[PDB]
RNA sequence: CCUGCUUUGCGCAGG
């Protein structure tokens, strides 16, 4: 282990207990190797949430629910939009939701979130969006949804580290399908930071988040 | 085999 892994390791340690149920997602997410948010970033994301108290979320990406629930039992009074795109993970979501009994305030669109634009747009404008899906395509998610943030809102993308690939020289990484995608990854985060339109920190919690927000 | 897709890490589309 080196000094990122323990850091990790020591705030997982020191986190409260949570509630059985979401215990029972973490665990069967685990067994079944279904990626779900890392600890600390979930901790640091309802923390994010917890200071805005925004009344609308978009989340894309839902896999089997557990980022939804958890935001929507920290926020019980705000309204989640979430879009998955593998049919299972859209059932399993859907069944998870229906078993905290969230399923009036979180709604879960099956399909490509490319391809969804309209049907989001109904329920626009959202004072959250976060991008937690296809790794190689936070540009494009970018473009087509913030659109449709609030004034303030905020948009939070997962993943912007890659397990500190993006921050190494990885030049000469293999395969090359992971080259490419470390490199867009690298490609996005430089693009999001030098935009003008916004104030976006990067936060180095788990997978890495970026959080940016939307200047008046 | 190699190149593109898919996946958090065997099947398509090419050479
Ligand atoms: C890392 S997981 C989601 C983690 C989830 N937010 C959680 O913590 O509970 C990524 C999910 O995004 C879905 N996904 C990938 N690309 C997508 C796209 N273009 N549109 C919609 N969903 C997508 C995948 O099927 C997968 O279930």
Known sequence: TDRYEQINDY??????????????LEAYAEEH??????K???????????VKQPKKILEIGTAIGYSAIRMALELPSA??????????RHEEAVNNIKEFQLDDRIHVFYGDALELADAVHVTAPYDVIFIDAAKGQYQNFFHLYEPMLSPDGVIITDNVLFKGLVAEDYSKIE?????????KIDEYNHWLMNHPDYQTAIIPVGDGLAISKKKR
């Open 11 to 24: 705030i997982e340690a020191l986190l409260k207990p949570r509630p059985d149920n979401v215990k029972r």
């Open 175 to 183: 395969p090359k399908r992971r080259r490419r995608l470390v490199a």
């Open 40 to 50: 600390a970033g979930m901790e640091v994301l309802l923390q994010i949430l917890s």
């Open 79 to 88: 309204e989640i939009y979430t879009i998955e795109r593998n049919e299972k």
């Open 33 to 38: 190797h279904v990626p779900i948010m890392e």
